[PDB]
Structures are given as structure tokens and as C-alpha cells.
Subunit: 458 residues, 4 copies
């Protein structure tokens, strides 16, 4: 049976899916080339990726390889009704309705994995966040021995596998694709460069040329934010803590500045550089840290400045300071005014206030529609290629003598990653040059790949 | 005492070094921080690196902290007479010479070690070409027994050590620093981005906005090459063989094409894409390979075109095809004219002629100045710090029970590289922020660093 | 008092949009203070037809503050912002504008701007855009032009039509060409589209743009901003032009120039179109203001799934009439439609050969988005409100017949007022202007506080 | 006929005159687009503009259209014999060098107008700066009744021409070329975005990525300079006296600053803002006014900063307060080192000293070759056609009534300015669209042009 808020919405879902799947050369090429080869025949997969219409393309892809699947949603908010009814109409069971209370979802966490009222024989597992990785070890250990392997994509859940490997709890092998080149370049750096100024303009509608912005942190995401601001016409300052990253910011044309005098933070009103915070119009925070934009910074900020976060979650900006002594007023669904004059009794025509986007949380998913389709394609294409390599190995059928040595946490091989990238090149219409036999020997590389060492920094 | 051509030029040399010292913060900062401690007192070092004012500054800051050194040359050709005099008149022996001749290094090497016809007491080596390692191992076996360590800068020479470590021939620990972040990002990427268009606009004195350009290979050198050309105003095409690099090049705003139909390199003129080559005029070869540009692209290229090589040797462009049928003419110190008609019938008004910038060899070192001093500064401070890290161990004074555990090729630890980068960031006027304790345990990194793991790509 | 807008419920939302907006326009809000006790526009009457965005609210508020009487209506089919029009109506201005209109509705709304209780009210001034409002008053209802002091024109496509009437002698009242000021030509036409074009493209269809190819028709003042908007994102752009000088400038900025027809000559057959390049183009944009710059033989040769959009002022740029008679249309969302090629009256749900069209080929950045930002629109609106005062003083209809024929022409404002606007517009960003020593002014040849460039200077 | 020097010339530059003329699309394209018939058979012209390798091509172009102009050299520099001996070898007399009579080269002028003692018959004049134009009124007025018109190429000279028209002394109509739109944008803007940074690097070999700059003025030269510095990664600031140019600077991604507090200059040491000045690493002068470098900023400037000039007038930098009161040194044949120690007596180890790159003059002349060919080629093509247009009116051969009303000074018409833009577009390989008669009617323009009104500001 299916649990979708409404089923009649499938008519719109298919119309939406047909155009969207036209934008994804990688999954289409995977469908085209492995026609007849059917490497997924006889494989039954259990999956938990978030139910967006994007993943419907993948779900239709790998089944076109000859695989039967069962499905659910990992997060209680990451779902779409029109796609959910679409898969329900297709035939694959779904429980991706939006309960938004987390009590109905806790009642159905095991409803998805049970066939009817008992466990059953499943072959491969594809998860998101490791929530299902906990389940088959702790709830129903019996079906563990038949699992060939696990694919998971998250860097906060891979640590769980890493520190259960040492404890000897991990029963069947796992694979990680987050640390690969294509996913790391596409998800982190690009997309943000494409969506940050979309989010700022879709919500505020202000001009950006000729103004001043401060960006804290210069990682992969910090670079994507710095590029998206300059190309619109702003002048950008970077605050960094790692000396090596700060060296790149200077050589790319930025002013490295510290909002504390001499770079020391003493937690006092006099530790701040008041000549800097009183001149800047926009602040963007790009760290996975805590309290990088503290209380003393904002009191020195110029009036009418815009605050937005793209980092981890609601810790970089002291938003808890806001609800204690400053008032909040609403403009639109996710733009607010914070009034510095007092907790209540504020006035519309006031001069000292602040502009906040997405009330602290991530904005490029809040004040816009997020990553496009050409980008969330090679991230997905690598994962389905995890299944093929992991299914052929036949972990469960191995006898106990050699079974022990293949229980490991490894990285996605580089040769596989060169095949997702080849289809994006052909998706853009590009042509890749072939190596003559005499030529490839000089590099000391196979004609088909891989071309680069394991330590190479792309 | 000395083999410099003229001792008298030392005053002019010193005049040059005095100004050159102004543009190297990293070397200067070392002297301020480590005064009074005098870490290098008692050390005796040999050197072999090529000579200039820059390495003269490096030697002066080396001897400032208390070391005694002897010095020589690594490259046969490159010579800097006035700086060599400037040091030979400082009281430090230098044995460089002019003549550009190989037969005298039989005596040039032996004069580096022989103090008075006898082996001299040594503690470190600062070899560059790896030739001192060879003489050290194969000659004077009784003397190398007290050497603490070795620092090398080149990947083509660290291989000769990494292959011999498995064989047990290596007798002293070494450090490879070419894989350090500062060394890799400064040299490969930023120097060429600074000097490519300068070399072009000196050699040709043309204009570059609104023209057709092709860049073959998309490595770090080629990643920094196209940036220098897109700023001037060129429409630039990119060719590549590694799919992931091409997938980057598409996402940087370049069109990816190949000179062969569908990419298959048959060998006959029937396979050359005649339409694409017919409107390009500037070529910059990036790859370190063989015949990446064979005869049929130069036989089919547009009528007027200039050739630029930034690779490593004389194998990227078929320059030996030139010498047998297409004649040459000199117009300026290094710019040549190549007429695609024959070796007879030279004419002065011909339209079908091509242009080489450095007769096929690398053009940056031939037609221009090379890297600026500021970039070259940070390449040397790591070699400074490596000597300290090797001197702090006292490898030769450890018991023979433990000496068997130290013959290794390790990389430079991250902390030293961060300290080198900090002295740069203070040179531009940037200020690096300091972490409070309550933010340090959040990541899992101490307040002093290093902040990134070993596997991180910057 | 009376109004017909999409809704009144959205009155609050527009206001908060405006209070922020008022703080982004230093130059216009300056005149609201300088001429506070001095009220030059007392007893004036205006009827205007401009895009009803969030900026056009502040201009109405300004004119009301200086004592004007306003009856206003929108200018285009898809241009109004239904929260911005609600506030102006809610304040008391009779206004008639909504979204998704038709040519039947387009002409009705203007028809209420002139008529009141059926009676044509005595209008002293007109604020027109695109020449539409001019044409009715001249061809219809001649009684109005014998009591009109002046009219103000803002777009370059209506200026052409207005100088067209002078040569024929059918023009009755003088006008100020507000479009030729520097704070209008080189501030709005160039930078405005740079901020809004690639915004509007991304909100409508939402594709990644880095790494695709596009074609741009026209390298005028709008063309430059358009090309920069595309290039800064990652596109591989080409420009097509009929003017040699603008073509040379396009070559100098790092672009390549091509033409849709072989050798450049447009015979009219299918054998003149070059399908070599049209078969790899994912985007075409019209910036011409002319007719038939994208004809029927071009659309047939186009690569599948390509995108088309227009930023001129009319529908004549692309030959739409072929599409709506030969090919079937399907809607995927507002202002975006799908046209299935080779299908006269039907289409499969899995078809591969089709095209996509943004807002049916009308003004896309204003129909598929919210238009230019507030800060750029400060100079031109200041020029407009300033030009209202200059004509309102001469009292054209009160002059005698001898003095009547000496005031009939078209002109542009003097440079000093432009510089005064530019100063207050600069001061907002945080710049500091440096005054000249009494020796420096004499050396250069200008006054210390006077004009600094002659009128021939092009900037 | 040879009068500049010895022949001295066989292959000392004549070779690269070929690449020079091939570089220039329009000046050579007209040569064959208006060949076949020769409209200029009988135009006897004289005077000078320059004498370079790029200046000898115009004379040959005129001759190919049938003219027989007589030439000589002028202006500040006349050592460029690498092309002068070629012109003399072509059969027309020319004068470049002289007996060091830079104060008075009028003796050369007497050798040009005269043929056999009797003055040479002429009907047209081609002048640079007017020192030769006055001669046909002050010294030899009897020849002028044969003149059809004159051409002038200077911004100061047109002022004197308009003054002469205000007076009555004008006796021949004259045409102006500086108003050509293809000349205004090329020589002003495009010529300094290619040459400023190249010259800076050529004379200093410095790194600019990360340093901070100040540029005074935002005219057309300023617009070129700002792009030429920004594209290299510097942080650029802008200063201006025109509010409109400042407005334009605000929206191009630059910041507006003022060397004087509140912008009010009064000569006091208390009104200047030394804090801003103590951080600027470079100042470039772009105006044409007086005292943009007062003696006070040279006192408050940061140590070891760079000062540059690209303007025309030398009172921009207070050089008189520098060549007095302070000591000077020469680093290299074009760069100088000036000490702020005091009157005299300096040790070469100090921290306060500045640097001048051409000593107050234009840096694109001394430290660089200058405007490349493809920019200043657009300038000359306005000259041959200007001769063509004035030759078909026959000003002298009109009766008295027509001659009185034809004495008028006008710019070159718009129709001729697009016939030069066509030939430069066609050079890079582009194609220009042709309009249909139905389209031509709708706009209001004939299919042959001109296409835009005269008050249009491109
Ligand atoms: N919203 C999105 O679309 C999105 C996408 C990818 C990642 N993320 C999130 O981004 C976060 C980090 O980005 P990343 O993955 O590029 O990480 P990263 O580690 O590569 O970058 C973090 C940088 O911040 C610096 N930093 C740390 N503490 C700082 C401080 N107090 N002040 C200044 N700089 C400081 C670090 O030195 C480092 O350079 C993660 O939490 C990740 O979940 C969000
Ligand atoms: N001039 C300088 O300043 C300087 C500095 C550093 C290195 N180098 C030299 O540059 C050379 C190459 O640069 P790198 O070290 O960054 O290279 P790299 O190792 O980063 O990669 C070389 C690139 O060439 C591509 N490639 C290989 N064969 C190809 C072929 N036949 N056709 C097309 N592409 C092909 C590879 O895919 C790769 O992208 C080296 O040999 C090095 O010695 C020069
Ligand atoms: N949407 C907006 O914000 C906005 C703003 C101002 C003006 N406009 C509109 O822009 C249009 C004109 O733009 P402008 O102000 O830059 O005027 P413009 O005259 O400077 O530009 C028109 C350009 O089109 C070129 N052109 C004409 N026929 C052509 C052809 N067949 N092929 C190629 N190019 C051709 C002309 O040579 C000229 O360069 C008008 O329709 C006007 O209403 C829109
Ligand atoms: N070196 C060359 O190749 C070259 C070429 C052409 C012109 N020039 C010379 O360059 C100079 C300017 O060139 P242009 O015509 O592009 O400039 P411009 O005439 O267009 O503008 C010069 C600017 O100087 C500004 N200015 C004047 N006094 C000022 C002050 N005290 N502070 C700040 N700004 C001030 C003015 O506002 C003006 O914008 C002229 O002297 C001209 O002769 C040199
Ligand atoms: N937001 C806006 N509100 C009103 N008019 C606008 C806006 N954006 C652009 N315009 C003007 O609309 C006209 C379109 O032809 C141009 O004159 C342009 O300046
Ligand atoms: K808007």
C-alpha cells in the first residue's frame, strides 16, 4: 500500500518529470549504454534517499537496468507530493507524505523495511544519513549476512561507519562517494556560485554593484560565495583563520581583515574594529563552526545591512541574542526586519534596523529553489555506479575464509568517476581526445584510465 | 679562491640585492622571530641550487641564524655573475663559472666538498638536481655517516630516492617538499598566470582583445594559463584528455573541442578537423607529453599564427619536422619566422608563415623574466624550515638500534607550511583571526593548528 | 477614487516594500525636501502610462507631494506588480492595471485614463512611454491638444515616433526628450538590463547557464548590458549587428559577431539561412526594436529545445504569427510556453522536437521578473519630475499666436541639473567629491561650482 | 633623395613593416576596396604628424590612391631612422635628424615648402600640432589661394583653429579628425588598457595581485587605466571632480575617495588625511590639470610607494619640490630612486624612499613602445578619406559668392566614420547583417547608412 497525501496529483507529476529528465545526460547515458547487458538483473535494493522529483529519474534509471526496489524518505520535510503520487502510480510503494510532526514518521520507520510484519531477504542498501545503517545492525541483525554492501552519501554519517569499523560492529562493507572529485566540485563549489546571488536578488531585489560585503571563511563554499559576489560588481573582504586558505584569498584579489583588534578576541566591547563594521553592507558566513558572528560584531554594524548564512546551521549567527532584546517584523515569507531600538514599541519609519534572510538557516534553499538539474546529476550518477561494482563482488556468497578480508570501508574507485564526467562533457557537446598507443606509454597510464594518482589535488 | 669572472662586480650586485630584499617578507620574518635563539648554530651545510639575487637573499638569511655553508651550482647554463660576486665578496665561497660547459663539473663538484683536498665535515645537504645525492652515495662512503638529513625540491628527483629506499641503498633520511601546498600553488599556478601574457606582449607587441585562442591540456599550468588570456579579451578553446579536468573547463566558461573527428587519432590527413584549425592563430601547449601537436595541425593551421610552448621540453610541438622542410628567419632576439613553402625560394612578402616564440622550448624563461620575487619567496621559506626540523632530531647521534626506523621519505608536516603562509599574509597587511578555546574543541583542532587533515585538497 | 486592480488585499505588503525603497533613492527624495515650502507644481494636471513597478510608486508620491494631480495606468501586458499598484490605488489615485491582460484589455485601460464620467478631463500634461498614449490623443479626441502645456517621453522607441510627427507637422505640443540625459541613457539602458536579464532567465525556466551558447541581436545601449549579463555568468555569447561602429565595439569587448543569413544577405528562401550555427544555439534574445529580426525560416532551422525571449518593446522582433498558425502550443507555467514543431494540431507527451518561449516574446525581464532595481531608477525619475517643473512654467496654451509658433520643438535639459542629480546620487554610495582650488579652475577653464564638460562631450 | 642621415638601412626594420601593415585591417583594406579608380590623382600635400614604423604606411596608402605627398619628421622624438631611410629610398624627400637644433627645427621647414628656391606647388596640408600651419599665414601667405583644405590632429590646435575662425585671418576651410568616434574610443580608452600594466611590470617586475592602488580622475584615460589595473587583482580606488564620472565609477566596482578631508583643499598640514595615504602602494595620474600631487601627500605617503604619470601635462606631480629638497638616484636607465632622508647624504639601508618610473612624464612613452597597431590604425584611416572628401569639392575653383559661404570648419561626417568601422570589423573575421527594404523603411534609414543621429552618445 501507499501513503501519499493525494494520488490525483500524478497527472502533473509525469508532465513535470518528462522535461526535467531531458536535462540529465549522465543518467540517460547510463540507461542507453547498458541496454541488454542488464548488470542489475536479480538485484533487489532498499533505498532511503530524500523523495524529490530529481531522484525519480534515478529510480527509473536503475530499474531500467533490471532491478526491483522498495522506497521511503529519509527526512520528514524533503518530499514532493506530485512526484510521490507519480511513483505511487508507477507501482513502487511510497511513504513520503509530509506529516511534519515526526510522530507519524516514527511509526513508519520500520514499516518501510518490513515486507508485511516480518523482515525479508534484501540484497543491497542505499541510504541517506546512516539512519537505516543503524537499523539493520540493531533492529534485525538476521538479514545482515545476505547484504552484499551499503552505499551512503553524507560526511556526518560516514563517521559512524568509520568509528564502528574499529569497534568491530560493522558487519557488511560500505562505500563512500562524497570524497570523490566530481561530487565535491559540483555540490560544494558550484551551485553556490549559481544560487547565492539568485537568493539575494529573489528576496531583497536590491542592487549589488558598488557596495561592500564581508565573507567569513574561505573553504570550497567560501570560494563559490566570493566569485558570485564579484561577478555582480561588489568589493569583497575575507576573514579567515587558516593561514594557507588566507594566502589564496590575497592572491585572488581580496583584502584579508580581522574584526578584532590585533586579531585577538577578548569578549569585550573594545576588542572590535569599529572602523570596519561601521562601513559594510552585507555579511555572508561560510564555516561549519560556532559563533563566528557574535553579539559585539552586530552592534557596530552599519544600519540597514543584510545578514545571511549558507554554512552548517543556526549557530554561526547569534540569533538567540535577537529574540531576547530586539524586535522582529515581517516583510515577506523569509525576509525580516530586526529593530535595534528595543524589544517592543518599534516604528515603521525607523532608521536603525537589520535585514535578515531565511531567519538564520540556509538561504539558497530557503529564499530560492536551490541547486539546478545539471548539477544534481553527477552526484546521483556516481551512487548508482556504486551498486554495479558492489553487486558484482558478491560479498555474501564468499566463504568465511576470504569473507573477513573484504569487510572494509573503501573509497569509490577513480576509474568509475571518469565515466560520470565523460557524459557531462558529451551533455555539453564537448569532445574528448583519445590517446595513441605510443603516447599513453610515456605518461605511464592505461588508455582507458585512470590518468591521475590518488594524491593528486584537482 | 673563487671562479667568478670578476670579483669587482660585488658592489653592483649588492646594490641590486638591497632593493630585492624589500620584496620577500617570508625570509625577513624568520630573522625577527628566531633572533636570540640562534637555532642553526653549529650546523654545516652544502648547497647546489642555481644562483641569482633571490637565492643570495636565501643564503644570507640562512647564515643570519648561525650556520656555516658552502655553495655551488645545479644548472649548467643559468648564471648570475654580479650576485655570485656579491656573495664571494661576503666571505662565503662560491664556485660557479661561465662557459656553459659540462666537462668541468668533474672538478666543479669535487671542489664543493674538498676543503683542502680532504672531505669536509658536513651535517646537511641542500641538493637540487639530485646530483649531490648520487656522488654522496657512490663516492666518499666513509664521510656520509654523520649526515642528518636531505631536502629536495623536485619531483623528477625525489623519484630517484623513493625507488631506492625500497632497495636499501638510501642511508640518510630525506624530506620531499614539492608536494607541500605553498610550493605547489605558488609555482605551478600563479607564476605562469603572471608571466604568460607579459612574455607574449613583449615578444609580439600585438593586441589580444577579440581573437581566437586554443589551449591544449588543462592542468594547473593550463588552469592558470587561460585565466591570463581571458582577461586580455580572447575567445579561448580548451582541449583535454582527462574527463574530470574537461568537466571543470566547461564549468569555467570555456568550450571543449578536439582537433580530431570524434577524437580518434588515425594519423592520416583525412582525420584532421580542417574547419576548427582554420581560424585559430595562437597556440599554448600545456601538457608534458609527446607529439600532442603533430604535423597535420601545423600543416592545416590558419595562415598567420604564433606558437607558444609552456611545457617542459622540446616534444610538445614537432619542432624537428620544421628543420627538414620549413626554413627559419630571425626578426628579434627570440622570435622566428617559419615559411610553409620549403627550404628554397625564400621570399620577403609571403603570407603563409608561422611564428615561434622560443624556438619550441619553454618561452617563459626565454622571452621574459620568469616568476616575480614575491612568489619565489615562499618557495624558499619551507626549505628554511625543513632544515630546522631535520636539525632538531640529531639523527646521526641516535643509537644504531633506532637508526633503522628513520630511513624514510616523509612530507613536510602541515604546521611548518602554515607558519610560512602566515608571514606572507602579514606582508600584504592582512590580519589572521585567532580561535578562542570554546571554538577549538568544536572542530577538533587545537588553537595552534594544523586545521586541515592530510587528505584535504585546497 | 475608483480603481480596477487585481486585488486590494495586498495594500500592506506594498507599503513595506516602499519604505525600504524610499531609503534607496537619495536623488529623488532630495528634491522632495529642497522644494518643500516652494511648491512649483501647484494646480498641475498629469496623465501617465508607465510600467507599474515598485519604483513608479515613489514618482507618483513625489508629484503628489509637490502638488500634482495624477491619473495613471500601466504600459504593458505583463508589466504591473500587483502589490505595487495596490498601494497607489489604496492611497486615492484612480488607477487601472492588473496581470495577464489582452489587447482587448490594453486599449480599455488607456481609454479610462482620458475619459471621466465619459467626459475628457482638462489635461495640462502627459507622461507617456512607448508612443501608445500619444497616438490616441492625436488621432482621437482632438479637443485636448489645445490645452496641453507639454508632454514627457522616456523610451527610445517612442522618441523615434515623436520626431516622426514633427517632420509631418502633425505634432501640436513640445516635448522634452528625457531619454538623452546621461543619468538616463548611460545609467538605465546599460546597467539596468545587466542586473535583470539573467535574473529573469533563471526565475522562469531555471537552467544552469555556465557552459552553454547564446546569440544576441543588436549591440546598442541595451545590447551591451545584455551581453555583460550573460558573460558574467559563464555563457559563450555571440552578437549580431547591422551597425559597423557598434559591431567594432562588440569585437573590442571580447565577443564574436555572426549573422543568421549566409554572407549576410537575406534573400527570403530557405537556402539563405545558415543551419550550421543555428543547430547548436540554446538561447536567442532580441534587443533590436525593429521588425522581423527573427523570422520563420530561422525558427525552423533552430536546434531542438532552444530558448527564445525578447526585451524590445513590441512583438515584431520574432515572427510569432507563423508559430501561432502552424504549430500547437502548451503551457507549463505562467509566462512560459511550449510549442511542438511539426505538429499542426496535436502533440505526444514524449515528443523530442519542440521549442520553449518566455512570456510569449514580450518584455521578459519586466514580465518574468520584477525589473530594474530601485537605486538605478533614481536618476531617470529625478529627470522626469524635474522636467515637469520646467515645462509647467512656460504656460504653452496661454501664449499668444505670435508667440505660439516659437515654442514648438523637441529639446533636452541643461547639463547643470544633470550634474546636480549625479552628485546626490554619488553621495549615497559613500564617495567624496573634491573641490577645485581657485587656481585649478582658471587653468582648466571652468567655474568652481559650474559645468565641467561641454555639451558635445559623449562620456 | 636622402637628408635624415646615412642610408644605414637594409634590414633594420623594413622586415617588420610587413607584419605592421598586415596587422592593420582598415588602412590596407581600403587600398583595394577603393582601388581600380584613383580619386586622389593630383592632391599635393605637405606637413607632418609623426614618423614611425606605423606612420610610413599612411604615405604609401595615399600614393597607392595616387597622391604625391611630401613629408618630414617632427614632435619630441626624431631618432626613428629604421623607417625614415626607407621613405627616402622610395623617392620622396624627408627630414628627421638635424644639428641638435631642437629649439628651432624651422630650418628643416624651409627645406620642405621650397622646391628650387621657388616654393613647392601644393593644394593640401597635413599637420600635427600647428607649428607648420601658422607658416602659411605668418611667413608665406602668397601660396594659399591654391589650397582646398587642411587637416589637423591635435586638441590644442583645434582651439587655435576655432579662434582663427572667430577672427578673420582664416582663409581656407579646415576639417577636424579628433571628433571621429572610431578615433575617440580607440586612442583614448583601448590604448591604455593594453599599455599601463605592461609598462608598470616592464619597469618594476613587481607583483600586483593583492596590493592597493589610487588613480586620480575617471575620464576616458581613467576608464582604461582602472580596468588595466583591476584585471590583475589589485584593489583600485577612484578620485574625481566630475559627479557624473564618479557616478559611473560607483557602478563599475570601484570606490570613490578623497585625498583631502571633506574634499576641501587649503594647503594646511591639518586638512590632509594621512591615514588613507599611508596605505596606498601606487598612485597614477590621469587628469590634465594642476597639482593633483601637492607636496603634502608626498610627505604622508607610505614608505616605498610607486608614483606614475600617464597624462599630458607635467604639473600633475610636484616634481619641483622633489628635484629640490630631496636626493636622487638612478636604479636603471629609465627608473629612479629618491630618498626622503633630507638635503644630502644617504646610506643605502633605509626604510623611507620612493620610486619614480619616468620622473613625472608619460610612462607609456619611456617605459613602453606605446599604442599597438590595431588601435592607432583606426586613427590614421580617418586621414586618407578626409583628403578624399575635400578633394572633390574644389574650393578654390568656386566663384566669389560660393567661396565666401564655404569657409567653415566642420568635423568629419558620420557617413565616413562607418566606412572605417566596417573595414576593422571585417578584419577579425566577422560578418555584418544587411537590412531588407521593408526593415529600412520602418526605422527611417537608407540601407547604405548612416544609421544613427548626430546627438547619439555611443
Ligand atoms: N548550504 C549548502 O549548499 C552547503 C553546501 C556544502 C556544504 N555546506 C556546509 O558548509 C560547511 C562548511 O563548508 P565546506 O564544506 O566548504 O567546509 P571547509 O572546511 O572546506 O571550510 C571551512 C572554512 O572555514 C574556516 N573557519 C573555521 N572557523 C572559522 C572562524 N572562526 N572564522 C573564520 N573562518 C573559520 C576554516 O579554516 C575553513 O577554511 C559545512 O557545515 C557543510 O555542511 C553547505
Ligand atoms: N613553466 C613553468 O613555470 C612551470 C611550472 C611548473 C611546471 N611546469 C611544467 O609544466 C608541465 C605540465 O604542467 P603540470 O605539471 O601542471 O601538468 P599536470 O600534471 O598537472 O597535467 C598535465 C595535463 O595535460 C593533460 N594531457 C596529457 N596528455 C595530453 C594530451 N596528449 N593531450 C591533451 N592533454 C593531455 C593531462 O590530462 C593533464 O590535464 C610539467 O612537465 C612541468 O615540468 C612548468
Ligand atoms: N526593457 C528595458 O528596460 C528597456 C530600456 C530601454 C529601452 N528599451 C527598448 O530597447 C530598444 C532599443 O534599445 P536601445 O535603447 O539600446 O536603442 P539603440 O538604438 O541604441 O539599439 C538598437 C540597436 O539595434 C540594432 N539593429 C537594428 N536592426 C538590426 C538588425 N536587423 N540586426 C541586428 N541589429 C540590429 C541597431 O543597429 C542598434 O544598435 C527599444 O525597443 C526600447 O523600447 C528597453
Ligand atoms: N598618454 C596618452 O597616451 C594620452 C592619450 C590621450 C590623451 N592623453 C592626455 O590625458 C589627459 C586626460 O585624458 P582624457 O581626455 O581621457 O581625460 P578627460 O578629459 O576625459 O578627463 C580628465 C579628468 O580629469 C578630472 N580632473 C581634473 N582635475 C581633477 C582633480 N583635481 N581631481 C580629480 N580629477 C580631476 C576631470 O574631472 C576629468 O574627468 C589629457 O591631458 C590628454 O591630453 C594622454
Ligand atoms: N522598474 C521599472 N519601472 C519603470 N520603468 C522601468 C523599470 N525598469 C525599466 N523601466 C523603463 O521601461 C522602459 C522599457 O522600454 C525603459 O525606458 C526603462 O528605463
Ligand atoms: K524592481
Amino acid at each position: 500500500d501507499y501513503k501519499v497525501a493525494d494520488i490525483t496529483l500524478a497527472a502533473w507529476g509525469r508532465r513535470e518529470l518528462i522535461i526535467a529528465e531531458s536535462e540529465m545526460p549522465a543518467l540517460m547515458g547510463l540507461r542507453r549504454k547498458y541496454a541488454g547487458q542488464q548488470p542489475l538483473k536479480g538485484a533487489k535494493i532498499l533505498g532511503c534517499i530524500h523523495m524529490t522529483i530529481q531522484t525519480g529519474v534515478l529510480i527509473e534509471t536503475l530499474v531500467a537496468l533490471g532491478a526491483e526496489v522498495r522506497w521511503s524518505s529519509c527526512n520528514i520535510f524533503s518530499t514532493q507530493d506530485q512526484a510521490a503520487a507519480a511513483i505511487a502510480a508507477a507501482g513502487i510503494p511510497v511513504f513520503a507524505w509530509k506529516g511534519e510532526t515526526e510522530e507519524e514518521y516514527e511509526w513508519c520507520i520500520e514499516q518501510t523495511i518490513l515486507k508485511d510484519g516480518q523482515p525479508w531477504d534484501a540484497n543491497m542498501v542505499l541510504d541517506d544519513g546512516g539512519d537505516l545503517t543503524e537499523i539493520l545492525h540493531k533492529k534485525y541483525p538476521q538479514m545482515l549476512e545476505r547484504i552484499h554492501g551499503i552505499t551512503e552519501e553524507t560526511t556526518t554519517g560516514v563517521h559512524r561507519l568509520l568509528d564502528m569499523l574499529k569497534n568491530g560492529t560493522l558487519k557488511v562493507p560500505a562505500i563512500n562517494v562524497n570524497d570523490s572529485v566530481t561530487k565535491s566540485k559540483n555540490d560544494n563549489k558550484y551551485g553556490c556560485r549559481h544560487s547565492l546571488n539568485d537568493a539575494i536578488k529573489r528576496g531583497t531585489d536590491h542592487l549589488l554593484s558598488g557596495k561592500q560585503a564581508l565573507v567569513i571563511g574561505y573553504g570550497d563554499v567560501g570560494k563559490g560565495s566570493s566569485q558570485s559576489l564579484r561577478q555582480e560588481g561588489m568589493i569583497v573582504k575575507v576573514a579567515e583563520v587558516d593561514p594557507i586558505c588566507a594566502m589564496q584569498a590575497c592572491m585572488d584579489g581580496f583584502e584579508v581583515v580581522s574584526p578584532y583588534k590585533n586579531g585577538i578576541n577578548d569578549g569585550t566591547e573594545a576588542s572590535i574594529d569599529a572602523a570596519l563594521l561601521g562601513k559594510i553592507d552585507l555579511i555572508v558566513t561560510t564555516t561549519g563552526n560556532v559563533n563566528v558572528c557574535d553579539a559585539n560584531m552586530l552592534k557596530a554594524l552599519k544600519k540597514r545591512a543584510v545578514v545571511c548564512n549558507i554554512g552548517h546551521f543556526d549557530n554561526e549567527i547569534d540569533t538567540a541574542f535577537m529574540r531576547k532584546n530586539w524586535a522582529w517584523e515581517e516583510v515577506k515569507p523569509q525576509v525580516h526586519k530586526i529593530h535595534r531600538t528595543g524589544k517592543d514599541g518599534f516604528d515603521a519609519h525607523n532608521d536603525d534596523y537589520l535585514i535578515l534572510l531565511a531567519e538564520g538557516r540556509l538561504v539558497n534553499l530557503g529564499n530560492a529553489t536551490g541547486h539546478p538539474s545539471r548539477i544534481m546529476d553527477g552526484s546521483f550518477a556516481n551512487q548508482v555506479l556504486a551498486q554495479i561494482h558492489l553487486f558484482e563482488q558478491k560479498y555474501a556468497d564468499l566463504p568465511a575464509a576470504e569473507k573477513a578480508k573484504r569487510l572494509s570501508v573503501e573509497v569509490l574507485p577513480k576509474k568509475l568517476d571518469e565515466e560520470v564526467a565523460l557524459e557531462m562533457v558529451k551533455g555539453f557537446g564537448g569532445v574528448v581526445t583519445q590517446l595513441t598507443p605510443k603516447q599513453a606509454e610515456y605518461i605511464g597510464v592505461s588508455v582507458e584510465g585512470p590518468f591521475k594518482p590518488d594524491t593528486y589535488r584537482y
